[PDB]
Amino acid sequence: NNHFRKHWQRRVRCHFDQPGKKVTRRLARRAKAAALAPRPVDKLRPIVRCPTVKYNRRTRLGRGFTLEELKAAGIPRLLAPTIGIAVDHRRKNLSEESLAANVQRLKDYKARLILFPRKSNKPKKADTPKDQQTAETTTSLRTSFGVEQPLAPGFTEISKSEIPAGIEGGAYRALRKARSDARLVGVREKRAKEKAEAEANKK
Amino acid sequence: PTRFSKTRKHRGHVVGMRHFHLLRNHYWRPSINIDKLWSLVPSDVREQYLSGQKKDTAPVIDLLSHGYAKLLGKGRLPEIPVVVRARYVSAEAERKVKEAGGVVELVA
RNA sequence: AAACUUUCAACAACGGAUCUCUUGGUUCUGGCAUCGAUGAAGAACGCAGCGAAAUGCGAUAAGUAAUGUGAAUUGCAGAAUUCCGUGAAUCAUCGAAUCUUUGAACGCACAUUGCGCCCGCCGGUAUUCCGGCGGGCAUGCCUGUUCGAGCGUCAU
RNA sequence: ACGAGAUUCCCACUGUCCCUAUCUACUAUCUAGCGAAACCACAGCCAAGGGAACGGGCUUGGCAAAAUCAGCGGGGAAAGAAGACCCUGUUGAGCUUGACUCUAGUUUGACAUUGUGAAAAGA
RNA sequence: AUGGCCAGAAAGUGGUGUUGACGCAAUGUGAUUUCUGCCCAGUGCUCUGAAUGUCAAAGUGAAGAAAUUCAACCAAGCGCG
RNA sequence: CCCACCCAUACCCCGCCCUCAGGGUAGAAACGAUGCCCUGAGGAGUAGGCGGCCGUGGAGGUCAGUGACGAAGCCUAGGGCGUGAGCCCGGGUCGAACGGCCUCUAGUGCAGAUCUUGGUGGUAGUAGCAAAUACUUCAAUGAGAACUUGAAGGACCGAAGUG
RNA sequence: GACUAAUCGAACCAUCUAGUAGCUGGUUACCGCCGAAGUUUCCCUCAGGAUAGCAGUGUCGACCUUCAGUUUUAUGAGGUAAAGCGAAUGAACUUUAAAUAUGUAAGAAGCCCUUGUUACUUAACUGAACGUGGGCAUUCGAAUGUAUCGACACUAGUGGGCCAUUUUUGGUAAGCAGAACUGGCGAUGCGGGAUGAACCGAA
RNA sequence: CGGGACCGAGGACCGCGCUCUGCAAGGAUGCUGGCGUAAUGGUCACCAGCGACCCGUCUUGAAACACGGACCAAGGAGUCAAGGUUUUGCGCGAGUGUUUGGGUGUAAAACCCGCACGCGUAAUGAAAGUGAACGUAGGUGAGAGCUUCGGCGCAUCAUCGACCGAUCCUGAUGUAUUCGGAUGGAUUUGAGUAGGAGCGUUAAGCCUUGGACCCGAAAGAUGGUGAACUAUGCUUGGAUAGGGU
RNA sequence: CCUAGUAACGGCGAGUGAAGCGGCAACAGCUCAAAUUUGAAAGCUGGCUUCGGCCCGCGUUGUAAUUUGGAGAGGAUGCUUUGGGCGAGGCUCCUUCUGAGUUCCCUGGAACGGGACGCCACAGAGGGUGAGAGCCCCGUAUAGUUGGAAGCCAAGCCUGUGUAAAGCUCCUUCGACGAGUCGAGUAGUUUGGGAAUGCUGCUCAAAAUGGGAGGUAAAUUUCUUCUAAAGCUAAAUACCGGCCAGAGACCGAUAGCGCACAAGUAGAGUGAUCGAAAGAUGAAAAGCACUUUGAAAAGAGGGUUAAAUAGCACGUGAAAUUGUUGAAAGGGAAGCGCUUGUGACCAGACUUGCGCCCGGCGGAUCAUCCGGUGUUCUCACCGGUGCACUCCGCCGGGCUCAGGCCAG
């Protein structure tokens, strides 16, 4: 299983520039942080659940918050990308739980936000006052607003009187019955339709 | 290293069905036998449960958090009631959990 | 016995190995984005007191200006530099210029230093002739200007 | 008729021989000057023996005396002979043909370019 | 000559062609003299002479809920004569 | 038929080398224990397999390493060690660096390839230096004159020319 | 098939390109320890393959069980020589019995008895097979030899060669041609055959 | 009882012995002479006696043939990468692997961090799917080691059983009366379970693919350059005594 | 990075081969066409300008504002939003400047070598200087420190305020959305998508909850996702070209690029193109004055140099091959092995050691005891005591033993 039948020597990529590229990336990050100070170096991201049945046990960071999440948090969609919040217009909220989690995330960020006035001599009422502008800040939203609990807890404890009775017949029999019903959903519907037609014909 | 090779010494002497667009994530269901079930409990709590200092509590184990979807039934269990939450379970694994005095809860 | 041929040694030849050296290669890494009708890359021909080449330069020709430095250059010759200075130097920098004939190459040509056209200026007796000098004259396309063509559509 | 085409004969003619001899020039030769190359495992007298039909070197004999010059063409060397010939190929290439698969050209049909009126036969 | 024989990738392309059968093109034979053993009809050459016998694509009909399937019809060539 | 005698790397005895095998060696006065001591047997080798050592360029560590009072290199009818590849020293030449030990590393070891590049022999002072008719005398120049010049002669091209 | 710049049955230049070759040539220090092989069996052959066998390094297992190109004993094959027929009968006669080499067997892992079953077999619970239990250690039931074990792993060459004694099968005018075993050589020096792939001695 | 030759390994004692004040008994001492340096010894050159083919290379069984080699110096040919496999060393171990990345730095080093992921921890089936204890993880026979001397028995081997999946047959209680598939059998099968052994790394051997030990072919293809030679043609020029018929 | 050598494709099989998810690096979003400004083309190129504008025009076959599906338009409703100008300070790039021995001795032509005594070090990187230099010189380290230009960022501070534009919340309603295009057939090509891929040509050719996709062909009924046929946009990514810079367990003049040199040069070819060889005197030319022999080249003396055994043939100067000198051998090969011999030339070894007995010197680090100290805790060291029948050296004799080579 050796794929060396093409002119492979023309397209060999070595990586001797790995430490140099790491140094260049760190220099670029330092320059971006110095240019963006006192703002954090990154944008606030929502918590999303990974697709497919393999990865839906785990949550991670998404692209941006939804318009519904911004509306429920009270943050206008034009103000949001100017105060460090990422916006994603494609994503929708199919269920209430993720919507509530991301709305609470936005409200925590809004409670921790310090908003400097556009003009120092003319502050507005949406702006943070000068007596509150001084506080210990964070510069990594991926760290301070990360995924705290990416998986469910793998172990809890309950009293022995709170042990559930379980599904009737057993979980194995419940799984077998669910698979059988899914396989026979159409045949039983056709049989019921034929029986109803026969009953209507010979009532 | 070239000085250790034999060349230096030899110097002077020379079926079934096809499945189009297979997605492996459809078939993700890792399995754990019941003889490894107590190893998912943290060590101090596991030793307390096995010693018998917890006679009023039962451990609830989420297999999907540990990365398992099916509970298989190789081995034997101690006589301690355990709540197990799993996507799939074998008949023998359920039978052994029920003898141990716990229950297998189905999740998705 | 010598000579000759061969062997061994010393010194001398022939030749350029060995050793040591390296203003050069080779590979990797890091930084930067900047050619040309405002005429590029390339080519030719020239330029030094004494050069054929390499280098630099373009009839302002081993260079001019400007800025900085501050006493050379050097193979020969000849001159320095008021050294208490608008200042040496094959110096460095470089923002101002010069930049022959060409070349995408542009009046038409070019195997020719061939032949033109337009407009000014100057000189030779000069309204007519002769000569010199300066500025122009390629193609495709765009925007606008102005001059036009066609019962193509009309009004009067 | 013509012919640097292939063949047999006749007369003349004669150094083709018989049968060789002699002369001239230029070389070869010697000297002064100048000055290569091919080739070269090592070397070079033979005889008999050396199973594989081969000896220069081994065995047994004949023998065998420095250093040289002109010739010579028996071996040994010497042929762009690593040629030519024969044999072999996962052989190469040119060429031929109802060998295979294709194909330029040619030919035939259909759709499009493709419009305006008639008359007749079928829907 | 709305042609023959060629050329070009194509072209509002070129040649033959400033050409027209006493011409142009392709063959075979090879001055003159001599000279066409006798007769066909198998292969071949050519006849739009009747056929659909073979019969592509397109088009036409039948069934089917449709994919599709089945039918005729069917140019040139081949075949037959 | 008989007696004596000759000699193989064969056989016997002895020494030495190596390999293999079997033993001994700590209340350590005790050892490159990867050592030392005792005993026995065995020894050809192509294809092939394995082990140990020697050498070359470069790297880390180390030797308080060598060196202009002479490094490296080279020559040597001068020596010492090793079965061997090799190692070391003396003498001569020379002029600026180099080596030992343990690890690391490789563009690491030549007699052959009608090799590659460069250099050099025998042949050998040899083969030739022989088409185009041809040269000679005196003087001058000069270190030196057949093939320079002047004069004096003799010849050739022979007008489809050596013009 | 001439000529197209000394190049022509398809010129020259650069590139693809370090094109491919199974064919030719070459392939670089020393010492030590082992050390080979030519139809064995299967496959359509030549322009063929695998494969057995023989080798070296590692290990491991109780390196435990013993085993053996040998003799003897018992019994086969070779009854073939031979003795007698005052034994019978007449190589084919036999009381007895050759030589050369040759097959099989020779223990506690063995032998025998008993009990059942049988889906084997037999007229048959009869033989045989499978189990069951028991007895036989009083000598473990010839000789000689025995640094000779076993099982893995990985690696390598050679796997339809030459000569010769013997046996055997065919042949030729005469030569000779197939097989089987064994020995030698290819891989090998030494003493002797004056000399030397195949001889003698000896490694 | 004589005569001669070659050798002297070892290095306190220990032993077997005897002829027992000692010895010839587990290996040489004693006495004496010359010389003390090229005398012994060694190296080189040569003579003498005996011995002794020219090296690779190729071929087959082997020779012979054939091919290469005038001489010398310097280069000069099993390498690197990826992926397997077995063995050796090392770390951790049901886990293992920091180095894609992030942090940090005395800055390509070293040090530190973690989500995911890879391999392993479970297999079987074409698939849907199902998925590994009757037993101190079984019985019997061996088996190192240990033993309280009765036995316990590692690894491993042989044999009989048990469990999981696949195949075939039967089809229980139940029931969306057409689903469900228990129980019991029979064949093979799988490096399956039956008290985990793997993951990472180093070193060596072998494969497998790349130019792949080095040097070569006749070739094939892509794009360019030539009619100064020569072939043919067009345009424009030049040239060729004297005789015979 | 992983997915993954997996799904899949593949004569007679050699082989080929993605994607979603997941972790990370980097992240950034938007503009049109389809609407009547219609109570006012509100838009724009060019020319002339007194810089106030004014003209020639483009354009209604549509130039501004508004809207882009995330929506929007119309309403309703009540709150919020905005324009300019200074600017401390910081950063980027060139510029002035930076520590310490030429102290003494020896070798040497020359110290930059050896020895002694110092000093600097946020500098002991590198190079030069007559041989290995931290302190002779350039540089090197570090904070800064002179002078200059152009940008960027930025703590804050002055002012205008609502004519107008903008955001938020709700809603009956409305809500235009790209055509020879999508799609279908067929042909070629391509792909893992030779049932599921893309592209292009020809023919046919759409629609309005429509259309595309949902990797096995079709009909029926559902569902899920987006919204094609118009357009812009930094970063993370690539880099055998160019420019600048720093490095290496790389090569060391037949190596490394073909080229360390007047190298893509000289040279060759009609041309396309092909394409070398070739570095080193010495620290300093001090590159040989002068004499003499030769026509000259040169030779010989004699200087120069540390050395000409460095003479512009030039560091070192191997082998092949050659000359001279010295030695030897040779009757059709030499070379080589074992063993003597001759000649020539050499390495070792040896030269005396140790121990007793006398005699003569020169000294008390003899034994014991005391104190101090260290140790291995019983052994030592240091200071006092020796008073010479004891220790330690030296010199004369004598004796034993052991000593080199060859032999009987």
Coordinates of N, CA and C (backbone and C1' of nucleotides) in Angstrom, one line a residue, chain C residues 6-55:
Chain C
rU6 P 65.7 -1.2 -18.0 O5' 65.8 -2.1 -16.7 C5' 65.0 -3.2 -16.5 C4' 65.4 -4.1 -15.4 C3' 65.5 -3.5 -14.0 O3' 64.2 -3.4 -13.3 C1' 67.5 -4.7 -14.4
rU7 P 63.9 -2.3 -12.3 O5' 64.7 -2.8 -10.9 C5' 64.3 -4.0 -10.3 C4' 65.2 -4.3 -9.2 C3' 65.4 -3.3 -8.2 O3' 64.4 -3.2 -7.2 C1' 67.5 -4.2 -8.8
rC8 P 63.9 -1.8 -6.7 O5' 65.0 -1.3 -5.6 C5' 65.3 -2.2 -4.5 C4' 66.4 -1.7 -3.7 C3' 66.5 -0.2 -3.5 O3' 65.6 0.3 -2.5 C1' 68.6 -1.0 -4.1
rA9 P 65.1 1.8 -2.6 O5' 66.4 2.7 -2.2 C5' 66.9 2.6 -0.8 C4' 68.2 3.4 -0.7 C3' 68.1 4.9 -1.0 O3' 67.6 5.7 0.0 C1' 70.0 3.9 -2.0
rA10 P 66.8 7.0 -0.3 O5' 68.0 8.1 -0.5 C5' 68.9 8.5 0.5 C4' 70.0 9.4 0.0 C3' 69.5 10.6 -0.7 O3' 69.2 11.7 0.1 C1' 71.2 9.5 -2.0
rC11 P 68.0 12.7 -0.2 O5' 68.6 13.6 -1.4 C5' 69.5 14.6 -1.2 C4' 70.2 15.0 -2.5 C3' 69.4 15.7 -3.5 O3' 69.2 17.0 -3.3 C1' 70.7 14.0 -4.5
rA12 P 67.8 17.7 -3.8 O5' 67.9 17.8 -5.4 C5' 68.9 18.6 -6.0 C4' 69.0 18.2 -7.5 C3' 67.8 18.5 -8.3 O3' 67.6 19.8 -8.7 C1' 68.7 16.4 -8.8
rA13 P 66.2 20.4 -9.1 O5' 66.0 19.9 -10.6 C5' 64.7 19.6 -11.1 C4' 64.7 18.6 -12.2 C3' 63.4 18.4 -12.9 O3' 63.0 19.3 -13.9 C1' 64.5 16.3 -12.5
rC14 P 61.6 20.1 -13.8 O5' 60.5 19.1 -14.3 C5' 60.7 18.5 -15.6 C4' 59.8 17.3 -15.7 C3' 58.4 17.4 -15.2 O3' 57.5 18.0 -16.3 C1' 59.3 15.4 -14.3
rG15 P 56.6 19.2 -16.0 O5' 55.3 18.6 -15.2 C5' 54.6 17.5 -15.8 C4' 53.9 16.7 -14.7 C3' 53.0 17.5 -13.7 O3' 51.7 17.7 -14.2 C1' 54.5 16.1 -12.5
rG16 P 50.9 19.1 -13.9 O5' 50.2 18.8 -12.5 C5' 49.5 17.6 -12.2 C4' 49.5 17.3 -10.7 C3' 48.7 18.3 -9.8 O3' 48.2 17.5 -8.7 C1' 51.0 18.4 -9.2
rA17 P 46.9 18.0 -8.0 O5' 46.6 16.9 -6.9 C5' 46.2 15.6 -7.2 C4' 46.9 14.6 -6.3 C3' 46.7 14.8 -4.8 O3' 45.5 14.3 -4.4 C1' 49.0 14.3 -5.3
rU18 P 44.7 15.0 -3.2 O5' 45.7 14.9 -1.9 C5' 45.9 13.7 -1.2 C4' 47.0 13.8 -0.2 C3' 46.7 14.9 0.9 O3' 45.8 14.4 1.9 C1' 48.9 15.2 0.1
rC19 P 44.6 15.3 2.5 O5' 45.3 16.3 3.4 C5' 46.2 15.8 4.5 C4' 47.1 16.9 5.0 C3' 46.4 18.2 5.4 O3' 45.7 18.2 6.6 C1' 48.4 18.6 4.2
rU20 P 44.3 18.9 6.7 O5' 44.6 20.4 6.9 C5' 45.5 20.9 7.9 C4' 46.0 22.3 7.6 C3' 45.1 23.3 7.2 O3' 44.3 23.9 8.2 C1' 46.9 23.4 5.8
rC21 P 42.8 24.4 8.0 O5' 43.0 25.6 7.0 C5' 43.6 26.9 7.4 C4' 43.8 27.8 6.3 C3' 42.6 28.4 5.6 O3' 42.1 29.6 6.4 C1' 44.1 27.7 3.9
rU22 P 40.6 29.9 6.5 O5' 40.1 30.2 5.0 C5' 40.6 31.4 4.4 C4' 39.9 31.6 3.1 C3' 38.4 31.7 3.1 O3' 38.0 32.8 2.2 C1' 39.1 30.1 1.5
rU23 P 38.0 34.3 2.7 O5' 37.0 35.0 1.7 C5' 35.6 35.0 1.9 C4' 35.0 36.1 1.1 C3' 34.8 35.7 -0.4 O3' 33.7 36.4 -0.9 C1' 36.1 37.6 -0.2
rG24 P 32.2 35.6 -1.0 O5' 32.6 34.3 -1.8 C5' 32.8 34.3 -3.2 C4' 32.7 33.0 -3.9 C3' 31.3 32.3 -3.7 O3' 30.4 32.7 -4.7 C1' 33.1 30.8 -3.2
rG25 P 28.8 32.3 -4.5 O5' 28.8 30.9 -5.2 C5' 27.7 30.0 -5.1 C4' 28.1 28.6 -5.0 C3' 27.1 27.6 -4.5 O3' 26.2 27.2 -5.5 C1' 29.2 27.2 -3.4
rU26 P 24.6 27.4 -5.3 O5' 24.2 26.2 -4.3 C5' 24.5 24.9 -4.6 C4' 24.4 24.0 -3.3 C3' 23.2 24.2 -2.5 O3' 22.1 23.5 -3.0 C1' 25.1 24.3 -1.1
rU27 P 20.6 24.2 -3.0 O5' 20.1 24.0 -1.5 C5' 19.8 22.7 -1.0 C4' 19.8 22.7 0.5 C3' 18.8 23.6 1.1 O3' 17.5 23.1 1.2 C1' 20.9 23.9 2.2
rC28 P 16.2 24.1 1.1 O5' 16.0 24.6 2.6 C5' 15.9 23.6 3.7 C4' 16.2 24.3 5.0 C3' 15.4 25.5 5.3 O3' 14.1 25.3 5.7 C1' 17.6 25.9 5.9
rU29 P 12.9 26.4 5.4 O5' 13.2 27.5 6.5 C5' 13.1 27.2 7.8 C4' 13.6 28.4 8.7 C3' 13.0 29.7 8.5 O3' 11.8 29.9 9.2 C1' 15.3 30.0 8.4
rG30 P 10.6 30.7 8.5 O5' 11.0 32.2 8.8 C5' 11.2 32.7 10.1 C4' 11.9 34.0 10.1 C3' 11.2 35.1 9.3 O3' 10.1 35.6 9.9 C1' 13.6 35.2 9.0
rG31 P 8.8 36.1 8.9 O5' 9.3 37.5 8.3 C5' 9.6 38.6 9.2 C4' 10.4 39.7 8.5 C3' 9.7 40.3 7.3 O3' 8.7 41.2 7.7 C1' 12.0 39.9 6.8
rC32 P 7.4 41.3 6.8 O5' 7.8 42.1 5.5 C5' 8.4 43.4 5.5 C4' 8.9 43.8 4.1 C3' 7.9 43.7 3.0 O3' 7.0 44.8 3.1 C1' 10.0 42.9 2.3
rA33 P 5.5 44.7 2.6 O5' 5.6 44.8 1.0 C5' 6.3 46.0 0.4 C4' 6.5 45.8 -1.1 C3' 5.2 45.7 -1.9 O3' 5.4 46.4 -3.1 C1' 6.5 43.8 -2.3
rU34 P 4.6 47.8 -3.5 O5' 5.3 48.2 -4.9 C5' 6.2 49.3 -4.9 C4' 7.3 49.1 -5.9 C3' 7.1 47.9 -6.9 O3' 7.5 48.2 -8.2 C1' 9.1 47.6 -5.8
rC35 P 6.9 47.5 -9.5 O5' 7.7 48.1 -10.7 C5' 9.1 48.2 -10.6 C4' 9.8 48.1 -11.9 C3' 9.1 48.8 -13.1 O3' 9.4 50.2 -13.1 C1' 9.6 46.6 -13.8
rG36 P 8.3 51.2 -13.6 O5' 8.1 50.9 -15.2 C5' 9.1 51.3 -16.1 C4' 8.7 50.9 -17.5 C3' 7.4 51.5 -18.0 O3' 7.6 52.8 -18.4 C1' 7.5 49.2 -18.5
rA37 P 6.4 53.9 -18.2 O5' 6.3 54.7 -19.5 C5' 6.2 54.0 -20.8 C4' 5.9 55.0 -21.9 C3' 4.5 55.6 -21.9 O3' 4.6 56.9 -22.5 C1' 4.8 54.3 -23.9
rU38 P 4.1 58.2 -21.7 O5' 5.3 58.4 -20.7 C5' 6.5 59.1 -21.1 C4' 7.4 59.3 -19.9 C3' 7.9 58.1 -19.2 O3' 9.3 58.2 -18.8 C1' 6.9 59.5 -17.7
rG39 P 10.5 57.7 -19.7 O5' 9.9 56.3 -20.3 C5' 10.0 55.1 -19.5 C4' 10.3 54.0 -20.5 C3' 11.6 54.0 -21.2 O3' 12.2 52.7 -21.3 C1' 9.9 54.1 -22.8
rA40 P 13.7 52.5 -20.9 O5' 13.7 51.2 -19.9 C5' 13.2 51.3 -18.6 C4' 12.6 50.0 -18.2 C3' 13.5 48.8 -18.4 O3' 14.4 48.6 -17.3 C1' 11.3 48.3 -19.2
rA41 P 16.0 48.3 -17.7 O5' 16.0 46.7 -18.0 C5' 15.5 45.8 -17.0 C4' 15.2 44.5 -17.6 C3' 16.3 43.9 -18.5 O3' 17.3 43.2 -17.8 C1' 14.2 43.7 -19.6
rG42 P 18.9 43.5 -18.2 O5' 18.9 43.1 -19.8 C5' 18.9 41.8 -20.2 C4' 18.6 41.6 -21.7 C3' 19.7 42.2 -22.6 O3' 20.9 41.3 -22.7 C1' 17.7 42.9 -23.4
rA43 P 22.3 42.0 -22.9 O5' 22.3 42.6 -24.4 C5' 22.2 41.7 -25.5 C4' 22.1 42.5 -26.8 C3' 23.2 43.5 -27.1 O3' 24.3 42.8 -27.7 C1' 21.2 44.6 -27.5
rA44 P 25.8 43.3 -27.4 O5' 26.0 44.5 -28.4 C5' 25.8 44.4 -29.8 C4' 25.7 45.7 -30.5 C3' 26.8 46.7 -30.3 O3' 27.9 46.4 -31.1 C1' 24.8 47.8 -30.0
rC45 P 29.4 46.7 -30.6 O5' 29.5 48.2 -30.6 C5' 29.4 49.0 -31.8 C4' 29.2 50.5 -31.5 C3' 30.3 51.1 -30.7 O3' 31.4 51.4 -31.5 C1' 28.2 51.8 -29.9
rG46 P 32.8 51.7 -30.8 O5' 32.8 53.3 -30.5 C5' 33.5 53.8 -29.4 C4' 32.7 54.9 -28.7 C3' 33.3 55.5 -27.4 O3' 34.2 56.5 -27.7 C1' 31.0 55.0 -27.1
rC47 P 35.6 56.5 -27.0 O5' 35.3 57.2 -25.6 C5' 34.7 58.4 -25.5 C4' 34.4 58.7 -24.1 C3' 35.4 58.4 -23.0 O3' 36.4 59.4 -22.9 C1' 33.3 57.6 -22.3
rA48 P 37.9 59.0 -22.5 O5' 37.8 58.7 -21.0 C5' 37.5 59.6 -20.0 C4' 38.4 59.6 -18.8 C3' 39.8 59.9 -19.0 O3' 40.3 60.6 -17.9 C1' 39.6 57.7 -18.2
rG49 P 41.0 62.0 -18.1 O5' 42.3 61.7 -18.9 C5' 42.7 62.5 -20.0 C4' 44.2 62.3 -20.3 C3' 44.6 60.9 -20.6 O3' 44.4 60.5 -21.9 C1' 46.0 61.9 -19.0
rC50 P 43.9 59.0 -22.3 O5' 45.1 58.1 -21.8 C5' 46.3 58.1 -22.6 C4' 47.4 57.4 -21.9 C3' 47.2 55.9 -21.5 O3' 47.3 55.0 -22.6 C1' 48.2 57.0 -19.7
rG51 P 47.0 53.4 -22.4 O5' 45.9 53.3 -21.3 C5' 44.5 53.3 -21.6 C4' 44.1 51.8 -21.9 C3' 42.7 51.7 -22.5 O3' 42.6 50.6 -23.4 C1' 42.7 50.5 -20.5
rA52 P 42.2 50.8 -24.9 O5' 42.0 49.3 -25.5 C5' 40.8 48.7 -25.1 C4' 40.9 47.2 -25.2 C3' 40.0 46.4 -24.3 O3' 38.7 46.2 -24.8 C1' 42.1 45.5 -24.1
rA53 P 37.4 46.8 -23.9 O5' 37.2 45.6 -22.8 C5' 37.0 44.3 -23.2 C4' 37.4 43.3 -22.1 C3' 36.5 43.3 -20.9 O3' 35.3 42.7 -21.1 C1' 38.8 43.1 -20.3
rA54 P 33.9 43.4 -20.5 O5' 34.0 43.2 -18.9 C5' 34.0 41.9 -18.4 C4' 34.4 41.9 -16.9 C3' 33.7 42.9 -16.0 O3' 32.4 42.5 -15.6 C1' 36.0 43.1 -15.6
rU55 P 31.1 43.5 -15.7 O5' 31.5 44.7 -14.7 C5' 31.6 44.5 -13.3 C4' 32.1 45.7 -12.6 C3' 31.3 46.9 -12.7 O3' 30.2 47.0 -11.9 C1' 33.6 47.4 -13.0

